[PDB]
Design a protein around this nucleic acid. Sequence first.
RNA 1: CCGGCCGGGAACUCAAAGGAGACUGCCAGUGAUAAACUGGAGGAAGGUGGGGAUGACGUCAAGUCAUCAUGGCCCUUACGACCAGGGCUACACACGUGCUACAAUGGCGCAUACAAAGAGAAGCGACCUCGCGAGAGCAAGCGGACCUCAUAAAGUGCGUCGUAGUCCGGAUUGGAGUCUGCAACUCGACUCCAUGAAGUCGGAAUCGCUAGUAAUCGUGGAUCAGAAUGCCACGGUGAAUAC
Lengths: 114, 127, 98, 151, 96, 206, 79
Amino acid sequence: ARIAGINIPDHKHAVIALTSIYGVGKTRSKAILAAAGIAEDVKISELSEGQIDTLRDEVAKFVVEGDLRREISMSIKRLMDLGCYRGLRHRRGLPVRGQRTKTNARTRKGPRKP
Amino acid sequence: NQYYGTGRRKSSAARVFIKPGNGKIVINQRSLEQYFGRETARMVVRQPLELVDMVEKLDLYITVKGGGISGQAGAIRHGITRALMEYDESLRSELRKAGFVTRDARQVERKKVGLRKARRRPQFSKR
Amino acid sequence: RIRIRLKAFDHRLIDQATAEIVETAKRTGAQVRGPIPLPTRKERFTVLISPHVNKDARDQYEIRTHLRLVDIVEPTEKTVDALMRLDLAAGVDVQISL
Amino acid sequence: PRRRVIGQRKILPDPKFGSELLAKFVNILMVDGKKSTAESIVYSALETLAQRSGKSELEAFEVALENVRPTVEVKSRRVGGSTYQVPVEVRPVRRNALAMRWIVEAARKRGDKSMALRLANELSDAAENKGTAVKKREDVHRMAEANKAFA
Amino acid sequence: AKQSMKAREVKRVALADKYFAKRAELKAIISDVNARWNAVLKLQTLPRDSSPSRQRNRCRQTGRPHGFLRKFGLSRIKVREAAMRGEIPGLKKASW
Amino acid sequence: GQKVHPNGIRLGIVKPWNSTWFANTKEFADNLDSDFKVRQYLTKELAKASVSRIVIERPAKSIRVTIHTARPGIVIGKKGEDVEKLRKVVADIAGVPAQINIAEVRKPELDAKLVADSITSQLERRVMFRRAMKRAVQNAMRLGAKGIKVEVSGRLGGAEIARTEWYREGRVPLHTLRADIDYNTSEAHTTYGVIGVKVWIFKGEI
Amino acid sequence: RSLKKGPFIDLHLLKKVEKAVESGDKKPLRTWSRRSTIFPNMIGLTIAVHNGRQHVPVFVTDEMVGHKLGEFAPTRTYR
RNA sequence: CCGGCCGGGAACUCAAAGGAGACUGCCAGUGAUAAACUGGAGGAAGGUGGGGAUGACGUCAAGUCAUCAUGGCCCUUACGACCAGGGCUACACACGUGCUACAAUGGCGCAUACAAAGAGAAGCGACCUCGCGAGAGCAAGCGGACCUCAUAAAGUGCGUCGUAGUCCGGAUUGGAGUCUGCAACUCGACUCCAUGAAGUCGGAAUCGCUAGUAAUCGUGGAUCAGAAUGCCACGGUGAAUAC
Ligand SMILES: [Mg+2]
Ligand SMILES: [Mg+2]
Ligand SMILES: [Mg+2]
Ligand SMILES: [Mg+2]
Ligand SMILES: [Mg+2]
Ligand SMILES: [Mg+2]
Ligand SMILES: [Mg+2]
Ligand SMILES: [Mg+2]
Ligand SMILES: [Mg+2]
Ligand SMILES: [Mg+2]
């Protein structure tokens, strides 16, 4: 039970199983099981092969997974190349968005030591 | 003529009308059940008919607005024993001992500059 | 047929331009649908009391603002000259038509 | 309590059964003033306990409570340098303000899925004194009695 | 608080109504589904303080730009000074 | 510092209010500035005309303005003359027309403000502060007054290091809300700084 | 990220971009307009962006368009 | 027209002006036949009923010359004045105050009952319509117990999840947008899609609160074009404990 990416998710309600893909955030999963003509609270047992690969197409639509990963990491370089602010920030390991750094910029700045 | 008692508690005001009849109860044009007779204090509207019997001896149609679930069910409860008025002051003595006579004066106490909420005091560290 | 709105911050006063107006009507023409009390809107202004710092100090002032309605049913031209020309009370806001 | 000794508000005996005692129980298990959802969890553990024990409901509670019930406690007493743990014979009325608190508090620190379940499993484990909470008695005993020396 | 820092705010209310509200609503509709010919917004090269929200809001008496209050156009410092001398109609130390 | 202003806490009760007009949110501010603009000019003018208090009202699109003075004539001038040249400018400043009554100050020794003002005006004159304080408190207890306290402050006489020093003669229950207390203020602008005068005058009760 | 209805730019700058287009670039090009959005009609120029103390040179390129002129002129010197 | 909606109705709810009421005063016990406490009576309220306002003489040369004022001192083609851009928002760290969690007393979907208190014309904005959305166009009422903000949330009913770094938790970042404003780069708020850090209840140590309080739950306001987890204010449900 693989669908899309190398990923192989299932064994619980569908809408939640699908989320497993890197590119589905519930909203996408609800639009998928809907456009596939599938009940969202169904497990995969009963979910015979017939319905499964119908989904595999519906997901195929979006730039999910590795292709997403690549695309997204591309966009972060684009910044760094341009040498703009939001980029210089990505290369610096400090928060891009503007969060204060005098304190609590910890997620981005990574755990403390010195 | 209609025999009546007010009864109000914590920001709720209910008006309770009596008339010998069934054991049916209306509130806000609604079944006792359908309003909150299936929630925290359904049993307490009934209360005011304990040492004072019924089951279906007198009817009571009421309304009530303000406050919340237990404030509204508090008022009404007060208005019943206040309307049991009509049926003498001989019954309104163990309506006393029942604690149903009293006006539950406990109000909500104000927020007060310097604190967080009424009593809640901003944690203070020495240094 | 005609009602007059009264407001002022002083209370022991507004109803004495009310009960005054009322009187200056039930004497003349009359009818007058009594003087209605009506929601007293009260602002509150809460401010810091030390020139510098001390956020816990603070004075807490308010401004009550009282109303009265009046309502006069029968408008006699005498009653109509009875508000007119007989009025006063400088710190009272009165509103004629609506 | 420097002076003004006091009495005690007397909450309203349990809306389902008619018991001061459980009203103390619920209020205890209660949290963030959620009485509504509080009494739910107690009767749902009393429901499983009632039938899972058979022997009624009221009386099933009492015999499991009759266990964790304490009789002697160690009251501190910081005197000349030493903290001196002084055992004292504890009141009957407190004797279950605790018992109930250790039972409730025991089921909270527990692995069962829902709180109703946990509660029932403490009631029951205590029923046959072999729980976390009963051990709180088999320890506050141990800790008094050792300071038995003092008296 | 520094004449000039006052004078500034006067110059700003001045301009705030020489142009804006007037000459500047030529932008209100000028920017609303009337699409386009870009000369539209571009026009924004006017005095700067012409804009209303360039105004600060200062204690009418002292000039303090902080602790201001609209009802009374004063700073909490002068407000309480007037309050305790009557001076502000209706206003008294309230309690409840 | 930690004494509620005496006048202020009384307004609701026993004490009046030196502005009484009504206005709504909108003009409420525009009025205040007007008021504090008129009391400004007027006090710089009738300075040496012993004025102790000026009330304002705006009776519908008009401004009334009473002026409590202990030198009614001096304010009024040669047969009305002055009041005219006041009304004149007082309406120029209020943006509306201006009546302007002149209330009389009977027994000025009883007015806190006129009391302070003199004590203030005495230091500038260059007189002993203990002396003035003691004159004040006397002719006061004299003409009635169930009590009075006046205190001063700051470089009393010249000190590099400043002081306060008061004088409580009689009764001055500042905690009783009934108690009539006329409390006011005045500052001396002297060659070695600024001296603050507070005076309380206890008149009665109810 | 804002605007929605007509990207923004300062006049005296946009006319300082056409005093070089029709002409052919001169030396750098000074603007304090860290405001303005960069247009396709600025690619290839070098615009001098004030950062507080002086104007940082910035060659414009095929993707510094939907960005602000200030994005490329660091303002707090940190090390 | 099953809408207090129209006649009407002056009862009731309320509104806001004025009144009575509570005094250890009445019974009793305790205590010097006192003060007082204690318990009982009646009573909406018993022992300054609940809360607020109110802060004595004074202590810390405690804080404020930057709110304003002001003695003295200093600058005066500069220590003053105008403009642009930046900065007060920096980031190896440390400490204080808070917000959000770690979850089934819970998460989520759907249905659904019950507040208080404020705000409003250079404003509150209904409706309808478009947009998944934040919003947008159009447009009524209301200076407002009328009209708008505004559909309280906890809660209750069903169902789902089944103890997992999870359907818990929402950081961080990519993408694309909305509104204010001359202008959202530095640094605004908000939305849609994706993203899913730390975190399984916190060492030493330490804080709050004695009842409509703590805890929990939503609501409004000042400042304010915009910019609240802070501040100020409101009620909902509602404890434990004091020898
Ligand atoms: Mg921190
Ligand atoms: Mg100045
Ligand atoms: Mg501003
Ligand atoms: Mg007192
Ligand atoms: Mg200092
Ligand atoms: Mg000077
Ligand atoms: Mg700063
Ligand atoms: Mg979640
Ligand atoms: Mg927790
Ligand atoms: Mg509350």
